[PDB]
Design a protein around this ligand. Structure first.
Ligand SMILES: [Mg+2]
Lengths: 136, 216, 100, 223, 42, 56
């Protein structure tokens, strides 16, 4: 005898209730553990519903300030001819070096975006990076 | 399960079409079970023989035992109004000695649950399954006084007219007691039922209302 | 201890930006006949076909070059409340990476 | 005598982290294993939005700060269950990781079911396994979806039998019936490999801790 | 047996061994007709 | 469900809660209120909630 009603309450609440009624005479071994270290949320059934009208989710689009610079670099030079290595946790791509230098110049106090874009290209050219201004 | 009792609520004897005899026979039986101490459940059993339908429904219901919260062991914690499909139920919490003034099927289940004093009205369709499902749906989703004290953080106080102005503390918040008084509106926006209000407005009831009946 | 917000900002995947028409390095971890399963550092692997040239070179552990298109192939169809995903990524195998 | 049995079983519940599961993992360790990568926004379940840090260009990102909190609770619960000699069943239907999960269960000393799940396995176990079959005391769902992108049958059936479930839930999953949800990536081999390692070390520590606790208390009885 | 709850512990225990063998051979890397006039068991 | 908003206004108990019983001199009470605005909210609520009690 049990409560195979998984849409009312939770495994813990149904086990608590069954013992109060007098049907379950021995506590499950997982019961005392749940009482002492419960989950953050109670595991109760809820019917997923759809959103209607003007209800919307609340998920923040992840856009950092570097993305403004990165977008320009991809539009002007595309992706660096060197291939991304996403297995190296500290990989520095050609675009990420462009954004690191672009930031340094902006710290000096340059206020014109055009100035920061052409100066960074010159600095990387001195470094020896091959930047191709591919309109294609 | 000697402490549990089983009660029948509906028995349908229907003939169905199958190649064995052209039209085969089938018995669908809805039952309820309860120990009279808060634990109760219902199930539907089908078979070709009535005895088999009784066994299937009786042992299936013992696997679907709800636990129903009773205020002081004799009544529901608060008024309950709900519509399950086209079956409307309207239950009311009552004082001791009031008895079970409810649909005969609700009296049967309430005895299994252990409720001793309550009023209920059923309107719309009288479908036995919708009434049984709707009854357990409302009785198993009711809010005990302790739950209300925990949710709002305030004391739950009770005022009985036979005890005068004496305040009775029925539930105290488990954690931290709040200090912000619960907002008291000047005029509540509660949605009232004409049937409940009509009585207090002085309107004559039916000749069938509040007749003398045997103890339930 | 670095925060998760810092890790995400400085992550190689965050630096990639959009994954369409990007160049990445992958590693072959599983081969089934002439189909190569390539892990390029994303959530889902891609599956390409063994090139005719230097076919024997593409063995397990071999690092290759790819041109990403999608990180996950998903599409909603009529009468569906959620997107249908095939649990796979889209990329074009360009050839072996020079060890140098 | 009775005090010793009470000491073995009642003392572990007086400490917040009796098995010191906190050290096994860290937010950085989870980030290396790509545990923060979720499905596209179209595949998102409504009950997962609490756990999602945001949407990075169409790909939902899973907050690894909530994952650490939830994973801590799930690992602690899995340890106390293993400490008390409960049966733990690993369940998944992902065929890429079928052999890995069966190897993990065998290493832990527990059970794995990575194959087609028969209807009634838990709700009708006596007919399938025998009259006195003991059901699992905990089910760990490394994957909570089957191969038709529907909830694994054992998620609902484990709730019906009042079995707690520790499950890995991704952005397209429904965590409502999972007792201890662990928000995280379930598709990447590096994410699944990390979770399998954590569950196996945690279970082995709890089993070893029980052996040591029994010897100490047992030795005291003569001594 | 760790595969008891599958319901076919002996069938799946054998399919576990043969699948692990296949993986080690594929990772590690002649005529296969070592035996002739033989059939697979029914 | 009783029709309208705040159906409690249509109960004898609510109508009897009014405490303003005018002196015999009072013969007419005109109420000038605006349906839109911010400074006239109390006036609108007075017509909604209190005028029935006064008339009763
Ligand atoms: Mg997934």
């Amino acid at each position: 005898a049990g409560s195979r009603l998984e849409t009312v309450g939770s495994v813990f609440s149904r086990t608590r209730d069954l013992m109060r009624a007098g049907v379950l005479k021995e506590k499950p071994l997982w019961y005392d553990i749940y009482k002492a270290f419960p989950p953050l949320r109670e595991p109760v059934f809820r019917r997923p519903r759809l959103r209607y009208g003007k209800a919307k989710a609340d998920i923040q689009d992840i856009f950092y300030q570097e993305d403004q610079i990165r977008a320009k670099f991809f539009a002007t030079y595309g992706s660096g001819q060197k291939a991304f290595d996403l297995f190296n946790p500290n990989f520095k791509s050609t675009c990420q070096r462009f954004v690191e230098k672009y930031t340094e110049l902006q710290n000096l106090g340059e206020t014109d975006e055009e100035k920061l874009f052409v100066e960074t290209g010159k600095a990387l050219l001195a470094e020896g990076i091959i930047l191709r201004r591919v309109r294609e | 399960y000697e402490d549990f009792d089983t009660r029948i609520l509906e028995v349908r004897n229907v003939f169905n079409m199958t190649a064995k005899e052209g039209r085969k026979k089938s018995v669908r039986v809805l039952v309820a079970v309860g120990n009279g101490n808060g634990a109760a459940g219902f199930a539907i059993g089908k078979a070709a023989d009535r005895g088999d339908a009784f066994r299937k429904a009786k042992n299936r219901a013992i696997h679907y035992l709800h636990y129903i919260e009773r205020y002081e062991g004799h009544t529901i914690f608060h008024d309950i109004s709900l519509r399950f499909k086209r079956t409307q139920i309207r239950m009311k919490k009552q004082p001791r000695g009031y008895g079970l003034r409810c649909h005969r099927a609700i009296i049967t289940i309430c005895r299994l649950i252990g409720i001793k004093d309550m009023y209920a009205r059923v309107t719309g369709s009288m479908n036995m399954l919708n009434l049984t499902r709707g009854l357990f749906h409302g009785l198993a989703r009711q809010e005990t006084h302790q739950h209300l004290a925990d949710k709002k953080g305030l004391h739950v106080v009770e005022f009985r007219e036979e005890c005068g102005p004496l305040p009775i503390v029925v539930a105290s918040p488990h954690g931290a007691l709040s200090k912000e008084p619960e907002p008291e509106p000047e005029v509540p926006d509660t949605k009232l039922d004409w049937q409940d209000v009509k009585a207090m407005q002085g309107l004559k009831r039916s000749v069938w209302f509040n007749l003398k009946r045997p103890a339930t | 201890v670095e925060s998760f917000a810092s890790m995400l900002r400085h992550s190689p995947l965050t630096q990639l930006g959009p994954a369409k028409d990007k160049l990445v390095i992958g590693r072959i971890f599983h081969i089934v006949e002439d189909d190569l399963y390539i892990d390029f550092g994303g959530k889902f692997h891609c599956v390409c076909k063994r090139p005719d040239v230097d076919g024997e070179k593409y063995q397990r552990g071999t690092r290759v070059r790819l041109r990403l298109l999608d990180l996950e192939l998903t599409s909603r169809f009529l009468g569906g409340t959620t997107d249908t995903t095939i649990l796979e990524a889209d990329a074009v195998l360009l050839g072996l990476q020079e060890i140098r | 005598g009775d005090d010793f049995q009470s000491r073995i079983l009642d003392t572990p519940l007086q400490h917040s982290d009796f098995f010191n599961v906190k050290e096994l993992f860290s937010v950085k360790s989870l980030f290396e294993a790509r545990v923060h990568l979720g499905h596209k926004a179209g595949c998102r379940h409504r009950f997962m939005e609490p756990y999602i840090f945001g949407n990075r260009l169409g790909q939902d990102i899973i907050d690894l700060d909530q994952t650490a909190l939830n994973l801590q609770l799930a690992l602690n619960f899995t340890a106390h269950v293993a400490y008390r000699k409960g049966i733990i069943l690993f369940v998944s239907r992902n065929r890429q990781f079928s052999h890995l999960i069966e190897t993990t269960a065998q290493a832990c000393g527990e059970y794995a079911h990575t194959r087609y799940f028969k209807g009634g396995l838990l709700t009708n176990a006596q007919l399938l396994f025998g009259p006195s079959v003991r059901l699992p005391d905990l089910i760990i769902f490394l994957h909570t979806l089957n191969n038709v992108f529907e909830p694994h049958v054992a998620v609902r059936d484990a709730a019906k039998m009042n079995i707690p479930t520790v499950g890995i839930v991704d952005t397209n999953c429904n965590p409502c019936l999972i007792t201890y949800p662990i928000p995280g990536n379930d598709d990447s081999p590096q994410a699944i490999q990390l979770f399998c390692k954590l569950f196996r070390t945690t279970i082995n520590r709890a089993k070893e801790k029980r052996r040591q606790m029994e010897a100490l208390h047992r030795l005291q009885s003569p001594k | 047996h760790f595969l008891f709850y599958t319901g076919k512990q002996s069938y799946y225990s054998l399919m576990h061994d043969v699948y692990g063998k296949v993986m080690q051979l594929e990772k590690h890397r002649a005529e296969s007709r070592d035996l002739i006039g033989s059939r697979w068991l029914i | 469900p009783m029709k309208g908003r705040f159906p409690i206004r249509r109960t004898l108990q609510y109508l009897g809660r009014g405490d303003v019983v005018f002196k015999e001199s009072v013969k007419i009470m005109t109420v000038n209120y605006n349906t839109y605005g911010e400074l006239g909210e109390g006036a609108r609520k007075f017509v909604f909630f209190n005028i029935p009690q006064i008339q009763y």
